[PDB]
Amino acid sequence: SGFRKMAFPSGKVEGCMVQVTCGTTTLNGLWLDDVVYCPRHVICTSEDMLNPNYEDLLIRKSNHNFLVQAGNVQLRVIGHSMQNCVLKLKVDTANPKTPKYKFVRIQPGQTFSVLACYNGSPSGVYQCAMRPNFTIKGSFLNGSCGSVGFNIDYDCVSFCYMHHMELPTGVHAGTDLEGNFYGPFVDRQTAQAAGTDTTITVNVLAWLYAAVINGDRWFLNRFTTTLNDFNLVAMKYNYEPLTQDHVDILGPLSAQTGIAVLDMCASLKELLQNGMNGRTILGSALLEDEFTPFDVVRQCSGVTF
Amino acid sequence: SGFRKMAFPSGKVEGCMVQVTCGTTTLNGLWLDDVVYCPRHVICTSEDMLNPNYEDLLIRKSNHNFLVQAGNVQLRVIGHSMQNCVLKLKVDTANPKTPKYKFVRIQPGQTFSVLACYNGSPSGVYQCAMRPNFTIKGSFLNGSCGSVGFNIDYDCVSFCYMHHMELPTGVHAGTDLEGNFYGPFVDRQTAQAAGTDTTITVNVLAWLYAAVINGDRWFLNRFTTTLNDFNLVAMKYNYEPLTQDHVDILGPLSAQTGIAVLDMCASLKELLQNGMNGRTILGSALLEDEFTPFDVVRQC
Numbered sequence: 135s136g137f138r139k140m141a142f143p144s145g146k147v148e149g150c151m152v153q154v155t156c157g158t159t160t161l162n163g164l165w166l167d168d169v170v171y172c173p174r175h176v177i178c179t180s181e182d183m184l185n186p187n188y189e190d191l192l193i194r195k196s197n198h199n200f201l202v203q204a205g206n207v208q209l210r211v212i213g214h215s216m217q218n219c220v221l222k223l224k225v226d227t228a229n230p231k232t233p234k235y236k237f238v239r240i241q242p243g244q245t246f247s248v249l250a251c252y253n254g255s256p257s258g259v260y261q262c263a264m265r266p267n268f269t270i271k272g273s274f275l276n277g278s279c280g281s282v283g284f285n286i287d288y289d290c291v292s293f294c295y296m297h298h299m300e301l302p303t304g305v306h307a308g309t310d311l312e313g314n315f316y317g318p319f320v321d322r323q324t325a326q327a328a329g330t331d332t333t334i335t336v337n338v339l340a341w342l343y344a345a346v347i348n349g350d351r352w353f354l355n356r357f358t359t360t361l362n363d364f365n366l367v368a369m370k371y372n373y374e375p376l377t378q379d380h381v382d383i384l385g386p387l388s389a390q391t392g393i394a395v396l397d398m399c400a401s402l403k404e405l406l407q408n409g410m411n412g413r414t415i416l417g418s419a420l421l422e423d424e425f426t427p428f429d430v431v432r433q434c435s436g437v438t439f
Numbered sequence: 440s441g442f443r444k445m446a447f448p449s450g451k452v453e454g455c456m457v458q459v460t461c462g463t464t465t466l467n468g469l470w471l472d473d474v475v476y477c478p479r480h481v482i483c484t485s486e487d488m489l490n491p492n493y494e495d496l497l498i499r500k501s502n503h504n505f506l507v508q509a510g511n512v513q514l515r516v517i518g519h520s521m522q523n524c525v526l527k528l529k530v531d532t533a534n535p536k537t538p539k540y541k542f543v544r545i546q547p548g549q550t551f552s553v554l555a556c557y558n559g560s561p562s563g564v565y566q567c568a569m570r571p572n573f574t575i576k577g578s579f580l581n582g583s584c585g586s587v588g589f590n591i592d593y594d595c596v597s598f599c600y601m602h603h604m605e606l607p608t609g610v611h612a613g614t615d616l617e618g619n620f621y622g623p624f625v626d627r628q629t630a631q632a633a634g635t636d637t638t639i640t641v642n643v644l645a646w647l648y649a650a651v652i653n654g655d656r657w658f659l660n661r662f663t664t665t666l667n668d669f670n671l672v673a674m675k676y677n678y679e680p681l682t683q684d685h686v687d688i689l690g691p692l693s694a695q696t697g698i699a700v701l702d703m704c705a706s707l708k709e710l711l712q713n714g715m716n717g718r719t720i721l722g723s724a725l726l727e728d729e730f731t732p733f734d735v736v737r738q739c
């Protein structure tokens with residue numbers, strides 16, 4: 135029993151974190167095979183971050199301008215290229231700790247583990263979700279840039295996020311490992327705002343199933359709803375629309391608990407209109423939306439990596 | 440900016456997880472140097488469990504009765520001894536991935552990361568606190584026994600918890616790495632109940648300081664309180680007494696934010712009285728108590 139916000143074991147990713155220094159700027163890099171990936175803004179100065187021409191800033195750099203440190207060992211940079219907003223520093227040594235990996239771009243609602251790093255050194259691991267507004271509500275300080283988001287599927291680390299910046303509201307913006315930003319963000323010091331966020335409905339339902347699996351049934355009721363009437367209620371409370379795909383994904387949890395997906399929607403509908411009434415679900419007074427249906431199954435079945 | 444429940448990177452602990460099998464029972468072990476530590480209940484039979492005599496059960500075991508597996512490699516057990524409720528299996532190979540480590544016994548309110556494991560294989564990492572009633576509100580399924588709680592301050596892993604069992608209420612009981620159980624619990628299937636749980640007051644105050652450092656001040660008020668009047672109101676909401684030690688520990692956060700501890704104590708009293716009124720503090724509608732003053736400072 136028990137349900138916690140749980141991250142993947144970060145060991146495979148820790149053995150990839152390196153420190154990248156370019157001038158006075160220090161951030162993190164991800165060393166996979168003979169390449170180090172890091173945010174391209176590492177080459178910006180104070181005047182540059184305001185309106186940077188990265189092609190022009192990069193052309194002025196030599197390989198030796200990039201100090202890459204893996205622990206206490208300086209890695210030799212033998213090449214440098216840019217792919218979208220990520221800088222790829224070709225190094226003389228292939229990382230002997232390179233796990234089986236893939237670069238995957240995730241969709242809003244999907245969760246991943248973040249290995250927060252400072253000066254190429256992992257300091258913490260947390261689980262978070264790609265918000266529908268494409269930001270992550272992370273925990274990052276100065277120097278965390280280059281810290282990565284990942285999942286593990288079997289023996290393979292799927293890298294899905296690289297941290298780049300913090301928006302004025304305290305939320306974070308980043309890219310996939312191919313340098314494409316999630317969301318309508320750009321890598322420059324300019325006025326940028328996160329769009330109004332919405333709740334990840336399929337994830338709330340998955341978390342309600344996790345609460346039932348853990349013995350919390352107070353919120354259940356005899357009622358059901360149509361998928362259409364639920365989306366009409368959900369749109370009112372800034373919830374993401376629930377699709378037939380989401381209903382199908384919740385199938386195994388519905389089968390395990392004996393509560394049809396539309397039966398759990400009527401519970402969620404009642405919780406949105408009436409509230410929790412002083413009660414808690416899994417030790418929370420809010421409807422938690424950062425556990426996917428797969429996260430619930432993984433944690434309630436003990437899949438190992 | 441931002442404040443999350445944050446676990447330590449589990450890599451140093453992952454390279455220590457091994458599977459320990461004794462008969463039909465399989466659980467996790469912690470391989471440090473040439474020793475594997477695991478719960479001593481691994482030697483219990485189905486007919487035992489209620490009143491096992493571990494000294495008698497262990498004396499009947501040979502080294503080859505303990506199958507220790509590190510990945511796909513069977514480790515050879517060359518010795519076995521018991522220290523309180525932990526079994527120490529001496530092996531013929533020192534773990535090459537042994538980090539700098541220490542065994543530390545923690546006090547209630549202290550937090551740590553748990554690397555949940557099944558069959559010697561890490562499946563997840565989460566943060567949790569040693570509750571005032573000495574249980575942990577973990578996430579553990581069958582075969583999680585032997586999974587450890589740890590902190591990693593400055594490259595050294597301080598091991599503070601080894602999972603032993605789940606109490607009837609769904610909470611968990613375990614020991615330090617010297618086998619001494621936290622709380623009035625025993626490694627027998629006898630009737631055992633966790634004492635009524637209480638909120639870790641110093642941790643709630645530390646989290647209120649974290650919210651102020653992150654720009655959230657709505658809950659603050661013009662009032663202060665005496666330490667005594669605070670504790671009189673706190674005990675009524677099942678909050679742990681706040682000691683002068685706790686007030687001193689909150690000193691650096693009080694200095695950083697400019698809010699005296701007893702001033703923050705008055706915001707807490709008001710919060711307890713009024714609730715949040717539809718508002719949230721650091722994305723939570725409850726008063727969070729699994730962040731210590733030390734966690735707040737490290738994360739901020």
Ligand SMILES: CC(C)Oc1ccc(N(C(=O)c2c[nH]cn2)[C@@H](C(=O)NCCc2cccc(F)c2)c2cccnc2)cc1
Pocket residue numbers: 135464465466480483488489579580581582583584603604605606607625626627628629630631
């Ligand atoms: C007390 C000792 C002699 O017996 C134990 C027997 C089983 C376990 N458990 C194991 O899964 C396990 C043991 N070996 C491999 N796996 C689970 C447990 O705790 N069950 C309940 C046992 C109990 C039954 C009545 C009363 C009590 F006080 C305890 C478990 C479940 C969830 C999370 N963690 C663990 C632990 C100790």
Ligand SMILES: [Cl-]
Pocket residue numbers: 461462463464481482483484485
């Ligand atoms: Cl047995």
Ligand SMILES: [Cl-]
Pocket residue numbers: 711712713714
């Ligand atoms: Cl009230």
